[PDB]
Every structure is written in structure tokens, then in C-alpha cells.
Amino acid sequence: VLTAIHLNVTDLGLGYETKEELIFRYCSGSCDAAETTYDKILKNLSRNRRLVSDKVGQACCRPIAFDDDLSFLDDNLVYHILRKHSAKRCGCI
Amino acid sequence: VLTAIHLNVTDLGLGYETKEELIFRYCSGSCDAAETTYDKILKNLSRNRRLVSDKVGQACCRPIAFDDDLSFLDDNLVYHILRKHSAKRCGCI
Amino acid sequence: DRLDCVKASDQCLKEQSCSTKYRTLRQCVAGKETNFSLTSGLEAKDECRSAMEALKQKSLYNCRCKRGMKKEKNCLRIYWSMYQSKGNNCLDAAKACNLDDTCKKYRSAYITPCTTSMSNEVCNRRKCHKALRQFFDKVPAKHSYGMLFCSCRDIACTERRRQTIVPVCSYEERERPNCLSLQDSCKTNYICRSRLADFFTNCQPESRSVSNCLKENYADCLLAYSGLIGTVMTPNYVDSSSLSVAPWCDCSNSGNDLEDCLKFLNFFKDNTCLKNAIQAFGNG
Amino acid sequence: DRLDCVKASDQCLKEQSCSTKYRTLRQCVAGKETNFSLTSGLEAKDECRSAMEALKQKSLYNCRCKRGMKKEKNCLRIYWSMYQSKGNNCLDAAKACNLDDTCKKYRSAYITPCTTSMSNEVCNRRKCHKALRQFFDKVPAKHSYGMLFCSCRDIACTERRRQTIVPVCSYEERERPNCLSLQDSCKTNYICRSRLADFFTNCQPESRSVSNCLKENYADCLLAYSGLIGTVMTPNYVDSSSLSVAPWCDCSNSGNDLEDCLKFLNFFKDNTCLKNAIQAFGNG
Amino acid sequence: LYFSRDAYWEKLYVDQAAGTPLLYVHALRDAPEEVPSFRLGQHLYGTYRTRLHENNWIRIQEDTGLLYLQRSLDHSSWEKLSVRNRGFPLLTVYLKVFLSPCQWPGCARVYFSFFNTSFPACSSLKPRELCFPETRPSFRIRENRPPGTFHQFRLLPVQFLCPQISVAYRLLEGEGLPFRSAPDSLEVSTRWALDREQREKYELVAVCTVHREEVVMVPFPVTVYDEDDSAPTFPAGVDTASAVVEFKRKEDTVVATLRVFDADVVPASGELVRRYTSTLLPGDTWAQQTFRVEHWPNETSVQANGSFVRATVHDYRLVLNRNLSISENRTMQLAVLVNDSLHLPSTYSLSVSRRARRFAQIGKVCVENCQAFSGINVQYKLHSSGANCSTLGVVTSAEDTSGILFVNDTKALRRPKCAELHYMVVATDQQTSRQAQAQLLVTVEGSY
Amino acid sequence: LYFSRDAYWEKLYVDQAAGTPLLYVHALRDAPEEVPSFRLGQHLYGTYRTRLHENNWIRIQEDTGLLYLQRSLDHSSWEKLSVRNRGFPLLTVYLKVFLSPCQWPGCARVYFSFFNTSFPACSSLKPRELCFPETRPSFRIRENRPPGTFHQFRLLPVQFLCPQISVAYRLLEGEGLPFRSAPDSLEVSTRWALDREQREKYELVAVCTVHREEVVMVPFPVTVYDEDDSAPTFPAGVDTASAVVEFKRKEDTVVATLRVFDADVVPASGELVRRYTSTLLPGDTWAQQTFRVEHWPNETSVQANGSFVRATVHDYRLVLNRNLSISENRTMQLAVLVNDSLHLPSTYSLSVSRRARRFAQIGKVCVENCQAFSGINVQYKLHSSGANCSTLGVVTSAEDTSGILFVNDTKALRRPKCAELHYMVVATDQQTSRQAQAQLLVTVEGSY
Ligand SMILES: *[C@@H]1O[C@H](CO)[C@@H](O[C@@H]2O[C@H](CO)[C@@H](O)[C@H](O)[C@H]2NC(C)=O)[C@H](O)[C@H]1NC(C)=O
Ligand SMILES: *[C@@H]1O[C@H](CO)[C@@H](O[C@@H]2O[C@H](CO)[C@@H](O)[C@H](O)[C@H]2NC(C)=O)[C@H](O)[C@H]1NC(C)=O
Ligand SMILES: [Ca+2]
Ligand SMILES: [Ca+2]
């Protein structure tokens, strides 16, 4: 799923001193039902012990599309733009 | 990283009765250094407790490109093709 | 796509009759080719009248629209021939803008080209100006005006307000030209001449013998003022203290026309109608 | 750029005299239209001689060059007129193919169009045939021949081998035509006529009075045979037991030419040179 | 006319004298007045039919079929031929022999094995090589064609160069058979027309006596090639019965198939070539030619061009006759007994919780069916989910035969429950399905 | 000629009689023979310069500047004007007045406040309204131009309609000043040319006596507008010193800037307009005009078109003269003391572990520098990492002044250690950097 939270820019912890705010959206939730043939193979290759399975992992709920650019003016009268910072759409990739 | 293992088609656990084989490649390893602004935000939003962090997760080592189609004839003289089954390239997405 | 005045003349050119009528009008009528005081027709007044009338029922007489981007001046030449001649309120605006899809989208669409990544790099002024015009064209008065015309109580607020248009890129220039020459230079371009005239129209005194305007004039003034932003005639607050505004010009070396230059400049720098309209937006 | 024989004929076509002379030669002289043994002129020998001589001093009589890339066959037709003329070994092949980038790629590139997803759907034959020709053209003899010419000891092996070309799609057809008519139909198409002639050339007897070929002929025979796959003349093993092969044809209703049809068919069905060449590839 | 062999063979040596006679060819007749006129092709041919050289050496007597050397073949001649043989050793050279103004029956190939030496000494030749060619000949004789001389036994280069060796020939095992080789004759002839129905193959024994007498015997095989000895029988005989539906229009409705077969050989034109045509159709009316039959395909099934009507009658006579020419005609007859008597449908929308009078009349297929096939003698049924299976009688099509399909009183139908019904509509003569089954779709909600 | 006011004003009422005199305008001279000829624009104008109507009512005496009513303005006249005033109430109407064949100095606007009533009863008028216009006038008089009559005090509609009310005028506070209003005169004149250097502004007192006498006084201001009373001084005076490098070619090398300022007013053409030109250049040689100075920009810095050579000499006289016409000329002089005496470089490749004789001669910038700027009196240095900072003397450029840059004996250089060196090369006259610093790049491996 897609989820939204209203935040100060300083809450983003990106090193900005300012009073400006934003809406930030993120992808969260379980989504590991082994959709593709590749992901079916991984579940099976682990169940029959064949892999050994060091750090192999299946699909993740990640962002597929990103929102508009967000601007702000800091306490020092310098502008900044955040790009690819908030999710628009979510999928298992 | 990309990794390769030589396998029987029955090892894939995809419901095929056959004696044919394949090379199968998969993406595995740690890769969660918070590359993008979005992923920097998530690490920070969790550290300062702001998220609550239900099922939110960062970048995964997934396949970015897939290999050629693989064919085989089963014990019942029926052909099959596997598509998007083995990884060609790996990235954190 | 829609040329406007120029396109219409092209239509006129297509037919022989219309072209001839246009030729006669140009020959007979001064239009705005000469000084108005001179307004001496090339031939005689009667001839100009006939030529003018001759245009009726032709494609010609057109209104000149701004849309002629590159060739504003050419359009303007035509068309004129006929026509004549910290908490704070600026912070609440920045908050409201970002929390809105249209404003956040259009705020950054202009901050992008108006700012520079490194100290001694320089912005593209035309990209910054175009995006500025886009901003006030596409974002409703509500959010667009809150940025520009917000009331303040302290310097953190005023310094923020003055930065709205990214002056370093969009306002300031190495040399400050004379105000009357830049007026000339503004009147060449279709966009500026169009936006400058609405300013002079909308932000003028009551038209009694008082040097103040009315409340019903307020909205039209702020629109006319805001429309100047992104043109050669871009205005900004001159300091971080008052509501006094001005283009990037002064009245040095006005020669014999010093009275007229300061008069033009005080229409920006000491405009009571503008002052009141700005104050009304973010006060009551 | 240089068509060669075809270009020359085009030159001949330009002039009326040359075209007529060419027409007479075609009418009178067998050329290589008929079997050489037959070499019975359409009319009489004397007439053919005159027609042939008639060509002298015309643009015509040309040598056919290779440069006619796409239309080699057409060029060759012209020019020749004048000139003349379970563990198992099939499983190991399927393993070796898939474990190789070129073969795995090209094996599935042909299985894709040659198979159907559902019971009473039907494959695209031309897509399946084209991809088949691609397979034997692009994959080295090593992997391509292992699939088709593998030695077997049991039916699991033979049933696998016979399936290589996806016969259901590429071989079988509702009605089985007469073999001599399909030969005719093969000779119309440039690809089949080219591949059929190499077969007859490469897989022919020793050219002494024995009905067997030599070991040095083996490779050329298998190439010529494999090249038939994906043409109208596509051959496959007729059962799941022997090495006997055949196109999708029979000798029913051959009328007066029954001898010649069975002779054509036994060149597929009882070919000792082919038999030996196939056996040599997967035996010793 | 046809040669009695497709291929002849002899040997040629270096330096054989101009004037050596080689062998005869023979042409038998296809009609009694026919007379062969023999001529050679222009070239000599070598291995795999390589064209070697113009033939400057061998000639044939045009009336008698005698081949002989007009010029000797010396070492240089054999070299000119060898070098043109495309790299193959020169073992055999052949010529074509045409029998009027190369394939059997009208062209024979004469092969000579070349031996790079002189003809052998006479005293060295054994009886077998004095008597017959190295491989014994076999013969082709057409049934039902005029008899005549088809072989000559004497080896001509041996009689010529070894005239002191006497050689004589006779047949064994020809008693009552059509072959004659007369005392002191070197020719063999047939005596009457052959017939494949009596004998397809003969195998006599040829016997040579050389000189002190020594005898050599070899088989003498003759294959009989075909005649229109036989006529065609319609296994059907009288096809008393045939049936076609009444007044059924079509490009070609197939009323019925009649068939015939010929006893003769299939490869022979006699058996195989059979053609079917309708000689007569009584009555003349309404239309003179209501039917046609495919002559050639031998499907020979009657098809009707024109319309039919209630039992007017119908009787056809069919002839199999092989050809207008000399073919044997035969007939059978059939009586046609006339049976006396477009774009797919849109999904139906119905509105949920529907109330009002029980029966809700929805669609009418009957005026489509009878409209297209032109019949009301057809019984309509409906089956699938709401009709005949699960929910039962929600949709019912009519005890009355008019293909009216209606919703009954399933308490007005619930779109929460089932929101779509797919039903199949059937039409059936008297037991038999005349039409394919159509698919009807009824959707359960509002608007459209 | 110029009007002594830019704007005049009076009142007009309904039904004022044809023949009412309104007011005078006045034009003073710019040259002694000038004589005004007054004419009106064609139209009357209303609010925000709306063009109302042709003026059918008011005329002017062309020699004397008397405006008067040729025709009375009745209720219908004021209606015709009101309805053309674009919806604004008609409060004021004006006319233009030109003083030869609308802006000061050559055009004056005459404004009339319209009062929708009859002229008031004479007995109702208070002294202030009998004596002066409602807002007192102020005047414009040019310095250094001929004196003359610039005002008339009597209110003409009041003298006309109320001739029984006597009104007289005088000035106070004009003692020794250039103004005359004579006993019994209603005119005011200047008596001699004015001069802004003596007085820029006057403020006299105008005094009206009505009739029982009552007196009203108002200020009487006069602004002095400008004359070329002043000449220009070169703050530089004699620019004894100027320097240019020897023989330096250029489009225009800037030798030095001389400047001048004018005491007069900047807005006045007198002060501001100053032009710089070089009157003379001795000596004539080599080239007669080695320099030029930008006349107008007032940058007035000398630039040289031609080349220079070792101390030939140089002396220029510069004139600021405002104009050819009546402007005051002045000069200063400067002596030019001549100083007596292209595409970027590729990265250098050097090979690692290099051995062979110490000094490895690599590149030579000196024949570039002296080649471009035409000087060998320049000292070359090198600084950055291997030269002057960290690793020290690995690259050294030469105690000898020829811009040869070489690798020294850093034990032949290690590509494992440092694989690239970036160094800056300097050129400097005698202390001063003549050139910009170039960047040199030395890469440490093989091939290219
Ligand atoms: C942005 O920052 C402000 C100030 O840090 C936040 O306001 C405080 O939030 C706390 C905790 O929820 C509240 O109890 C108080 O009302 C605020 N602090 C004080 C001292 O009054 C605000 O919540 C933040 N806004 C967003 C959108 O993240
Ligand atoms: C494919 O399957 C075969 C048979 O199951 C595998 O061979 C066996 O593997 C085991 C375990 O490694 C070995 O100990 C034996 O040699 C084999 N079994 C027997 C009974 O002999 C083979 O390893 C598989 N191959 C691939 C590539 O996955
Ligand atoms: Ca018979
Ligand atoms: Ca027969």
C-alpha cells in the first residue's frame, strides 16, 4: 500500500535547517506471495534446501513512481529542491 | 551480486516431470546503504521514531534484467518455455 | 499555434483586396509610427480616414495577443498602428503551497531553473522568467498571492518575502539602466508591453484629484503587478523593510527628461493604490 | 548494385529485339527445365539451335553471379537455362543445448511459435518454419546436429528425437499430397528449390554402379538434409523406430508417373548415404 | 510405336574397324499401320549423363534399327571423350535412339561399356560371352497391341570379328505361348496380341549353342504393359435410395455420393481413368438440370444447382464411361427422394427485482430459424444453469413450437445471488439437430 | 520662445455671454527677435485627457495671447461635452495653446473648472475670489534669456461682469530684484536676463487691493530654468603622467583615463553635456593619430589605434568643450610615457620508472609567452604538488629565464605512488603578473 504523513522538512534528517513542511508518501506492507516464475523458483529452491540461501530474498514493496519535486527556502535564505523523495505508486519488484 | 547454479528442471519445483536441465541465476547479498533520498528519509524517519515503522523496508537486491527463454520437452512429449526465470543483471531497487 | 495579430495579417495577405487595403492604411495613416504630438499624417487626415474605413469588412483590424512569443515586438508594431499608445504569514504561505499539488508542482518548476548549484555558476534567466510567468498563470491567486503579498512583523518574514522571485537570478543585473530606456525596451517585446500597460491602467489613482485608488480596484492591481514578474520589467521590493517596489532601473543620465523618469519610477516606488492593495491581501 | 544475370536480362528486356530472341530461346530450348535424361526439346533440336544462335550479338547470354543476394534462385534459374547442370544421447544434446547461450536462445526462439498454448488452437506455420531455418543457420553443427541426428537405444530416445522439429506444427497436415506435385510446389519457391537441389546433390550415391555414398560426402549430406526443415518440403522420421525419413507426401494417384514418384520418395525413405551419415554422427 | 526395351547395351574397344555392326533396336506397334523410323540423338553421353561430344562414330539404319560404326574409334577418339567426362573415369558412353520425328516408350538409351584394349582374341571367348550380353535383356510388350519382332539374339561384333565360331539360338518353355523363335531364326517375335488379364509376366529360357557343341542358357523375361480389356462397375448398382431435404437452396447441396471402380489397373488409364457424368435426369422439370456430379474427383457425389420441391419425382442415370474414345461405358441409376415437409445475438439486459405479471417475454429465435432455414417442423429446447441445470426453470422456452424464450417467476430475480446466466438454444427436426446450438447471455442489471 | 507657465486655469459657467474675456497666456523669448504667434488645438479635452469635441467656443488672439469666448456655452453645449466624457463627471475641460507653427515649453494647457450654474452675483464674491485664481500661479523663466512680460493679474471674467468692483495690484519683496509691476500696471515683467548662479528661485508677494479697501496677499513664486553660464574643469589638470607598455598592439589598449566635470547643472545641457576630444598630439610621428578618446561616454579614456615605440615622446591636449556652438571650452594635457623595454596545452604523458641522465626536458612555454605578448623581460615560476608543494622539486622550471619545464631526479618516478601531477605556470614582469597562470597536467604512464 501507499501511505502518507505530514512532516516538517527537518524531520527528513537530510541536513536542512528550515521551518518549511511537506507531505511524504511511502510504500509499506507485506507483499511476498511469489508472483513471478523467478520468485516461485526461489521459494522452491530454499524449501528443498538446494540454495543454501546466503542473502537471497524475494519481492519487496518498493516505490514504482515518484511525486513532484519539492522546494523550500531555508533559514539562511538558500533554496533547495528534493527530487525522487516521496512515492506516487507502489508495487512488488 | 549475480550468482549462477546448474540445475535439473525438476529442482525448480514448477510442476514439470522431465530430465532436462538449466543454468539458473539469482541476485543475493547485502545492499541497503540507503542510496536515494527516499531511502535516506526512511532510515531517518525510523531512527527519530517518527514512522512507527509497520512494514516499511529499504532497497532490495532484485533482478533488473532477465535471461533468454528456456525450453524443454517433458517425459510426456510436451514442450514448455520458461520466461523471466533467471537474472541477467542485479541492482538495488 | 495562435499567432494572433501576426496570423491575422497573414490571412489578410492571402487575399489581394485585403492586402491592398492594408497598404493604403499604412500609407495614409500615421498609426504610431511618429510621435503622437507630431501625429501628422503622411498625406492628409481625410485620406487616412478613408483608408481606415476601407479596412472594414476585411480580415484586417486585429487585436494583438501576447501569444506571439518570439516576435512580440513585431506583433506590437502591428496592432499599435491601429490601437494607439520563526512563525510568520509568509511561512504559512510556503506551507500551504507545498501541501497543495498544483502549487508545490509549480513552485519547484520555477525554483529549478532560477537557482544555481554552485557559487560562481549563473542561472538561465529566460528559463527562470518563463517558469515565473507559468507560476502566476497556473496557480490560483489564493496560493500565488500569499507568497508574494504576505504581511510581516519581522525581518525573517521580509527576507523570505523578498526572495520569492529568486531576485539574484530574476531581478538583479550587473548594470542598472535608466528607467525610461528600459520602458522603451519593455515596449518592444509583446509580453512586457502588454503587462506594463495593464499595470499602468489597473494601479492608477482614483481619477478624481486624489492620489489614491479604491478598494474595488485592488484585485486588478495585484494581478497586473504580479504579471510583470518574468518580463524585462521584473519588479521586486527594494529593501527588507517596506513595501516599496521597483524594476531594475534608476534615473541616472536622464538628461532633459529627468522629471519623466522619476515620475515613471515613483509609479513603482511610491504607489498608494499598490501599497493599499498589498496591505489589504495579508491584513484584513 | 551489380545484379549480374538478372540485371543483364533487364537490359535485354529494354530492347524489343533482344526480348523476342530470348522468348524464342525459352520456347525452343529445354534449358534445365526438364530432367537432363529427358532433355527433350519442347519443339525440335534444330529449332533450339537456331534460337540459341539467335541470341548472339544481343545483350543476352549472361553469366550469373552470386551478387543477386535475395534472389539467388531466380538468378540461378536463368543462367542455368543456358549453362546446364531416462538417460540417452538425445537427452545429452538437449542438455548441451540449454547450457549454451546461443543454442538455448535459438532453441526457444523456435519452440515459441511452433507450439500452441491450448488443445484446439493452431500454430503459425510460417513463423515456426522461419524460426526453424534460423535455428540450423545460427547454431553450429555441434549442438544443432546432436538434437536431430542422435543415436538411440530405446523409444524414450526416439520419441524425443522425432519431436525436435515439433512435427505437429511443422510437418503434419490434414491431407497428404502426391510427392511429385509437392516437388513442383517446392521448385516454385526460391528457398525450397535451393535446399531441395543441394539435398539431391549431396546425398546421391557414389557415382559408380553402387547405391551407397562415401564418408567424405557425409557432412554435406546432413547439412543439405537439415536445410530442408522449415520449407514446404520439411522432412521427419516416419515412425518411432528407424532412421527412415520422408516429406509430408505419398504416391497415391500418380497416374502414369508412379515409377518416378516412388523413386523420388525412396530417395528420402531408403537413402543409404543419409542413413550412414546420420549413423556416423552419433555412433563413432 | 514403342521400343521393346528402354535400355540396350554392348561393349566397344579401341580401334574397332569402321563397319563393325553393333546391335539392333526394335519398335513394336501401337496401331497396325505404324512403321518406325529410327534416329540417333546428336551427342554421346558419359558418366551421370555428362554431354561428351557430338557423335561422329555411330550411325543407325533408319528403317531396320541396326546400329554400326561409321568410323573407327581409335585411341585419340576415346581421349577426346574421356577428357569431356568431367573428371570421372570413362567407363560407359550412351546414345539416344528416337523411333519417330530420353524415356521409354519413344526413346531408348543404348549404353556401351568402353574397354581400353583391342577386341579380344576369338579363341579367348567363353561360350557365355559368345552367346548373350553380359547382363541378359528383359522386354516390354503392351497388351492388346499388334504382335511383331522384338529381339535379335546374335552378338553382332562377335559374328563380325569371329565369323568361324558358329552360334545358334532357340527358346524353351514357350509351348502354347505367344512367342516364336523359328528354326535357324535369330529373331524373336510375338504371334498374337498379349493380354494382362491372361498373363502379366512371362519368363522363357533362351538357349545358345556354340560350335564340340557347348550350350549356355539364360532367362528370357517379358513384362506385359496394359490394355483397356476391362469395363467399370458401380458397386452401388441401382441406388434406389437418395434423399435431399425439400426445397433446400444452396450453391450445391450434396444429395448423395455414387461411386464406381475399374477392374483394370489403377496405373493403367484403363482402370483408373473413370469419369462420372449424368446421362439423363427424368423428369425434365421443373428445371432440366437440377443436379451435377463431380466427374473427375471420383467423389462423384451429386450436387444440385437448382431447387427441389415436394415429391415431383427424380431419377438419374449415371455413366462411369472411361472416355469418349475407346473406354468401356457402364451405368447405375439413382433416385432422389425429396424429403417432403446471420450475425450473432446480443446479450440481454434484465432488471433485478423485476415485478409484474409472471411471464416476462424476452427474445424470439423461432422467426430467425424458420426464417433462415425455411422450415417450421423444428422443436426448440434450452439448456444450461437457469434452464435444465441448477436453478431449474428460471428461463423456459415454450411447449409451443415458436422459439419464444421467457423469464418465469423465479420470484423476480436477485442480482445478489446470480448476476449472469449463459444458456444454449437447440433446434431439432425429429430427433436430429438441424442447427448448431446458439449461446444466449442474460445479464441481470439496469440501463444498458 | 517658451510659455512662462505650463498650465493656466480659470472657471467657466453656463450661459456666459459670447465676448467674455477669459485670461492671457505669455511666451518669453529664447533669442531677441523671437515673437510668439498663439494658436489653439482643435479639440476640448475632459477627464483623463478624453478628447470631448471640436472647440466651437473659445478663441485666442494670435498676437496677444488673449483667450475669450467667441460663442456662449449654454446648457446644451455643456451636455454635448459631458456626454463625450466617457462616463466621468465633467468637472474640468482644457485646451492646448501652441506658441508657433502638449508639453512645456512650446505648448501650454489651459484648464477651465466647469460650474453648472450662472456666473455668481458680483456682491457675493469675496476679496480672495475677486483678486487671484483659486490656486495661485507659479512661473518659469529661463536664465540668460531676454526679459519680458510674463503675467497679467486681473481676473478677466470678474473685470468684465463686475466692472463696478475696482481691483489693483502690486508686488512686495522685489527690491533690487529683476521684477517690475508698475504703478497702475496689471502686468508683471522681468527687467534683465536671470541667472541661476545668482538665484535659482524667487518668492515675491502679490498684493491685491479691492474697492472700504480690502487687501489679499498671495505668494508669487518664480523658478529659474538654465543657462550655459559655466565652463568645464578637468580635475586632472595636467596629467603629467600616463603609461602604456611599449609597442603593445591591440584593438584599443587603454592608456589612461582623463576626466572632466561641469559646474553647471547636470540636467542642464550646460553642465552635463561635456565631450572629450583630442585637439592635438605632438609629435606627428610616427603615426599622426596614435590615440583616440571616447568623446561621449565621458569615460574619456585614451585608447590607441596605432603602435607605440620606445620613448619617441607623447603629448596630448584634451578639450572638454561642451559643443561647437556656444559651449565653454577648456583643456588639460596628458603625456603618455611609453614603457621602455592561444588554444590550451595538452596533458603530458611520461613513462614510469624512467631512467637515463638526470634532467628530462619536457615542455617549453617561454617561446609561447614571448611569442604572444612580445617580451622577454618576464620571470617564470611553477607551483603545485610536485613543484613548491608536497613532493617538492620533482618538476622545476629554470633559474634561466626561458620557460623550459623539466622533470628532475625524483628517482625516476613511480606510477604506484602518484599517477598524475597538476601544476600552474606563472609569468611576471618585475613583480607583476602579466599573464594568467596556465594549468599543466603531467600523466605518468605509457603509450598515449
Ligand atoms: C513540526 O514541528 C513542530 C515544532 O517542533 C511540531 O509541533 C510540536 O509537536 C509536538 C508533538 O506532537 C506537540 O505536542 C506541540 O504542540 C508542538 N511543540 C510545542 C513546543 O508546542 C509539529 O507537530 C511538527 N509538524 C509536522 C507536520 O510534523
Ligand atoms: C540432477 O539429478 C540427478 C539425479 O537426481 C543428480 O544426480 C545425483 O546427485 C546426487 C547428489 O549430489 C549424487 O550423489 C549422485 O551422483 C546422483 N544420484 C544418484 C542416485 O546417482 C544431479 O546431481 C542433478 N544435476 C543437477 C545439475 O542439478
Ligand atoms: Ca486383359
Ligand atoms: Ca488391362
Ligand SMILES: [Ca+2]
Ligand atoms: Ca478399363
Ligand SMILES: [Ca+2]
Ligand atoms: Ca549663472
Ligand SMILES: [Ca+2]
Ligand atoms: Ca547654468
Ligand SMILES: [Ca+2]
Ligand atoms: Ca556649461
